[PDB]
Amino acid sequence: ANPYQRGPDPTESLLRAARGPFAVSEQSVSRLSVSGFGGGRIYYPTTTSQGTFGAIAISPGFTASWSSLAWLGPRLASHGFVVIGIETNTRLDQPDSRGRQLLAALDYLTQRSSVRNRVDASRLAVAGHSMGGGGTLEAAKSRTSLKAAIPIAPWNLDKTWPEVRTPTLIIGGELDSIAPVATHSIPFYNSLTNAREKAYLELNNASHFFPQFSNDTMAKFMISWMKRFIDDDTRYDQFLCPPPRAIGDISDYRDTCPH
């Protein structure tokens, strides 16, 4: 009935496994072949028989390459998404620049890439770590049609985001000393006054570098948010509303239930 719904009815175990239910193919994008971003890597479900998929562009942080987040490529794509993980023009690009590059990567993916026919160009998203998370907010500010945004330990000197309409999940690290949640993540979250829905997931005792390593709780909530909002997949609301308790590996969760 939902034409965008993909995959089996979800469970906690499905979300926490190393791969979701789709085999993943990959394609390199050489820096020599594109303008507006530094190339990167595309990850996509091999099968086309279940329909097209929504897509997400993901940016690393300051000083970093895509390899710093590469585990997300196959993990997210295997749940039924096309992922373009970017290299930035330079490692020292600022958040606003990273936001423009995320949008350039989505435009390339849908307009010119050799996998464009697999992507539903109406169902796009952004995510990123650190300055790349700051750039995720910039991209959502610039392109209000984005269906989901996931800033991960975001860093940005711009603290307010009133233009953002996109459903936004901010994932913070409680003990982050580089983009402290009290001065980055949480102010961003409170400033999202016009986001259709939003949530803040704070990982207990986590440092700025939590997303550099496979993290099942992080992945669970990223996948659930992507499903719920890129795919309109209400089956994944069970993991978001009511909000999870702040216990164990979650030190805080803020929500806008009901979605």
Side-chain angles (χ1 to χ4, degrees), residues 215-228:
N215 182 310
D216 292 345
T217 295
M218 174 183 158
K220 165 188 169 181
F221 283 93
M222 283 194 71
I223 296 155
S224 294
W225 197 262
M226 293 171 62
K227 282 284 194 178
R228 177 55 183 89

PDB file of all heavy atoms in Angstrom, residues 215-228:
ATOM      1  N   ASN A 215      28.723   0.785  15.076  1.00  0.00           N
ATOM      2  CA  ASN A 215      28.019   1.046  16.323  1.00  0.00           C
ATOM      3  C   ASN A 215      26.562   0.673  16.083  1.00  0.00           C
ATOM      4  O   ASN A 215      25.867   1.346  15.305  1.00  0.00           O
ATOM      5  CB  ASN A 215      28.179   2.517  16.707  1.00  0.00           C
ATOM      6  CG  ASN A 215      27.519   2.853  18.012  1.00  0.00           C
ATOM      7  OD1 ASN A 215      26.356   2.539  18.240  1.00  0.00           O
ATOM      8  ND2 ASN A 215      28.279   3.474  18.910  1.00  0.00           N
ATOM      9  N   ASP A 216      26.118  -0.418  16.720  1.00  0.00           N
ATOM     10  CA  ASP A 216      24.810  -0.994  16.424  1.00  0.00           C
ATOM     11  C   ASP A 216      23.668  -0.075  16.832  1.00  0.00           C
ATOM     12  O   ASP A 216      22.658   0.005  16.128  1.00  0.00           O
ATOM     13  CB  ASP A 216      24.646  -2.363  17.098  1.00  0.00           C
ATOM     14  CG  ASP A 216      25.543  -3.433  16.506  1.00  0.00           C
ATOM     15  OD1 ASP A 216      26.100  -3.227  15.401  1.00  0.00           O
ATOM     16  OD2 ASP A 216      25.675  -4.498  17.164  1.00  0.00           O
ATOM     17  N   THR A 217      23.780   0.593  17.981  1.00  0.00           N
ATOM     18  CA  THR A 217      22.713   1.501  18.398  1.00  0.00           C
ATOM     19  C   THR A 217      22.620   2.715  17.477  1.00  0.00           C
ATOM     20  O   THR A 217      21.520   3.100  17.057  1.00  0.00           O
ATOM     21  CB  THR A 217      22.907   1.880  19.863  1.00  0.00           C
ATOM     22  OG1 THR A 217      22.748   0.695  20.654  1.00  0.00           O
ATOM     23  CG2 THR A 217      21.886   2.901  20.298  1.00  0.00           C
ATOM     24  N   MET A 218      23.763   3.307  17.128  1.00  0.00           N
ATOM     25  CA  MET A 218      23.766   4.376  16.136  1.00  0.00           C
ATOM     26  C   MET A 218      23.091   3.917  14.851  1.00  0.00           C
ATOM     27  O   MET A 218      22.219   4.606  14.302  1.00  0.00           O
ATOM     28  CB  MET A 218      25.210   4.726  15.807  1.00  0.00           C
ATOM     29  CG  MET A 218      25.327   5.715  14.677  1.00  0.00           C
ATOM     30  SD  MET A 218      27.053   6.019  14.302  1.00  0.00           S
ATOM     31  CE  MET A 218      26.947   6.608  12.617  1.00  0.00           C
ATOM     32  N   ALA A 219      23.521   2.765  14.326  1.00  0.00           N
ATOM     33  CA  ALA A 219      22.953   2.280  13.067  1.00  0.00           C
ATOM     34  C   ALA A 219      21.459   2.026  13.188  1.00  0.00           C
ATOM     35  O   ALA A 219      20.696   2.373  12.283  1.00  0.00           O
ATOM     36  CB  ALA A 219      23.698   1.029  12.606  1.00  0.00           C
ATOM     37  N   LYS A 220      21.019   1.414  14.291  1.00  0.00           N
ATOM     38  CA  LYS A 220      19.600   1.146  14.479  1.00  0.00           C
ATOM     39  C   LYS A 220      18.763   2.407  14.303  1.00  0.00           C
ATOM     40  O   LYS A 220      17.728   2.401  13.617  1.00  0.00           O
ATOM     41  CB  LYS A 220      19.356   0.551  15.868  1.00  0.00           C
ATOM     42  CG  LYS A 220      17.893   0.582  16.280  1.00  0.00           C
ATOM     43  CD  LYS A 220      17.664   0.169  17.735  1.00  0.00           C
ATOM     44  CE  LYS A 220      16.241   0.483  18.152  1.00  0.00           C
ATOM     45  NZ  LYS A 220      15.946   0.138  19.570  1.00  0.00           N
ATOM     46  N   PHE A 221      19.173   3.494  14.961  1.00  0.00           N
ATOM     47  CA  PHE A 221      18.356   4.695  14.898  1.00  0.00           C
ATOM     48  C   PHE A 221      18.510   5.411  13.568  1.00  0.00           C
ATOM     49  O   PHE A 221      17.537   5.980  13.065  1.00  0.00           O
ATOM     50  CB  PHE A 221      18.620   5.597  16.106  1.00  0.00           C
ATOM     51  CG  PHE A 221      17.946   5.093  17.345  1.00  0.00           C
ATOM     52  CD1 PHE A 221      18.619   4.260  18.227  1.00  0.00           C
ATOM     53  CD2 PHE A 221      16.618   5.368  17.581  1.00  0.00           C
ATOM     54  CE1 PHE A 221      17.982   3.744  19.343  1.00  0.00           C
ATOM     55  CE2 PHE A 221      15.969   4.858  18.687  1.00  0.00           C
ATOM     56  CZ  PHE A 221      16.654   4.046  19.570  1.00  0.00           C
ATOM     57  N   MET A 222      19.699   5.372  12.977  1.00  0.00           N
ATOM     58  CA  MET A 222      19.858   5.984  11.625  1.00  0.00           C
ATOM     59  C   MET A 222      18.956   5.227  10.635  1.00  0.00           C
ATOM     60  O   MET A 222      18.252   5.870   9.874  1.00  0.00           O
ATOM     61  CB  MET A 222      21.291   5.862  11.103  1.00  0.00           C
ATOM     62  CG  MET A 222      22.291   6.811  11.677  1.00  0.00           C
ATOM     63  SD  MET A 222      23.805   6.803  10.683  1.00  0.00           S
ATOM     64  CE  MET A 222      23.263   7.620   9.192  1.00  0.00           C
ATOM     65  N   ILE A 223      19.022   3.890  10.640  1.00  0.00           N
ATOM     66  CA  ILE A 223      18.213   3.113   9.708  1.00  0.00           C
ATOM     67  C   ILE A 223      16.732   3.371   9.953  1.00  0.00           C
ATOM     68  O   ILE A 223      15.947   3.546   9.012  1.00  0.00           O
ATOM     69  CB  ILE A 223      18.562   1.613   9.794  1.00  0.00           C
ATOM     70  CG1 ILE A 223      20.009   1.361   9.361  1.00  0.00           C
ATOM     71  CG2 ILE A 223      17.580   0.787   8.964  1.00  0.00           C
ATOM     72  CD1 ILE A 223      20.617   0.082   9.950  1.00  0.00           C
ATOM     73  N   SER A 224      16.321   3.393  11.219  1.00  0.00           N
ATOM     74  CA  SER A 224      14.906   3.591  11.515  1.00  0.00           C
ATOM     75  C   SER A 224      14.426   4.954  11.040  1.00  0.00           C
ATOM     76  O   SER A 224      13.318   5.075  10.514  1.00  0.00           O
ATOM     77  CB  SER A 224      14.638   3.428  13.009  1.00  0.00           C
ATOM     78  OG  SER A 224      14.879   2.085  13.429  1.00  0.00           O
ATOM     79  N   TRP A 225      15.235   5.993  11.259  1.00  0.00           N
ATOM     80  CA  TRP A 225      14.864   7.336  10.835  1.00  0.00           C
ATOM     81  C   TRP A 225      14.799   7.414   9.315  1.00  0.00           C
ATOM     82  O   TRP A 225      13.856   7.986   8.746  1.00  0.00           O
ATOM     83  CB  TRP A 225      15.897   8.337  11.371  1.00  0.00           C
ATOM     84  CG  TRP A 225      15.416   9.774  11.360  1.00  0.00           C
ATOM     85  CD1 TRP A 225      15.684  10.733  10.422  1.00  0.00           C
ATOM     86  CD2 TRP A 225      14.569  10.389  12.335  1.00  0.00           C
ATOM     87  NE1 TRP A 225      15.036  11.904  10.754  1.00  0.00           N
ATOM     88  CE2 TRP A 225      14.354  11.723  11.930  1.00  0.00           C
ATOM     89  CE3 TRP A 225      13.972   9.934  13.517  1.00  0.00           C
ATOM     90  CZ2 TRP A 225      13.556  12.601  12.662  1.00  0.00           C
ATOM     91  CZ3 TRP A 225      13.187  10.797  14.244  1.00  0.00           C
ATOM     92  CH2 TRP A 225      12.984  12.121  13.818  1.00  0.00           C
ATOM     93  N   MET A 226      15.797   6.842   8.645  1.00  0.00           N
ATOM     94  CA  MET A 226      15.797   6.785   7.188  1.00  0.00           C
ATOM     95  C   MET A 226      14.574   6.059   6.657  1.00  0.00           C
ATOM     96  O   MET A 226      13.910   6.540   5.738  1.00  0.00           O
ATOM     97  CB  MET A 226      17.083   6.133   6.698  1.00  0.00           C
ATOM     98  CG  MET A 226      18.334   6.971   6.973  1.00  0.00           C
ATOM     99  SD  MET A 226      19.873   6.091   6.630  1.00  0.00           S
ATOM    100  CE  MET A 226      19.724   5.782   4.862  1.00  0.00           C
ATOM    101  N   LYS A 227      14.261   4.886   7.204  1.00  0.00           N
ATOM    102  CA  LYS A 227      13.067   4.161   6.765  1.00  0.00           C
ATOM    103  C   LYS A 227      11.810   4.995   6.978  1.00  0.00           C
ATOM    104  O   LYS A 227      10.960   5.122   6.082  1.00  0.00           O
ATOM    105  CB  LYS A 227      12.976   2.844   7.547  1.00  0.00           C
ATOM    106  CG  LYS A 227      13.928   1.777   7.029  1.00  0.00           C
ATOM    107  CD  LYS A 227      13.448   1.149   5.735  1.00  0.00           C
ATOM    108  CE  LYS A 227      14.195  -0.129   5.395  1.00  0.00           C
ATOM    109  NZ  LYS A 227      13.688  -0.765   4.145  1.00  0.00           N
ATOM    110  N   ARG A 228      11.659   5.538   8.178  1.00  0.00           N
ATOM    111  CA  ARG A 228      10.429   6.234   8.518  1.00  0.00           C
ATOM    112  C   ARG A 228      10.205   7.429   7.614  1.00  0.00           C
ATOM    113  O   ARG A 228       9.073   7.684   7.183  1.00  0.00           O
ATOM    114  CB  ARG A 228      10.469   6.691   9.973  1.00  0.00           C
ATOM    115  CG  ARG A 228       9.269   7.496  10.422  1.00  0.00           C
ATOM    116  CD  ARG A 228       7.953   6.749  10.181  1.00  0.00           C
ATOM    117  NE  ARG A 228       6.784   7.545  10.534  1.00  0.00           N
ATOM    118  CZ  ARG A 228       6.180   8.351   9.678  1.00  0.00           C
ATOM    119  NH1 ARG A 228       6.658   8.454   8.447  1.00  0.00           N
ATOM    120  NH2 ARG A 228       5.111   9.052  10.042  1.00  0.00           N
TER     121      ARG A 228
END
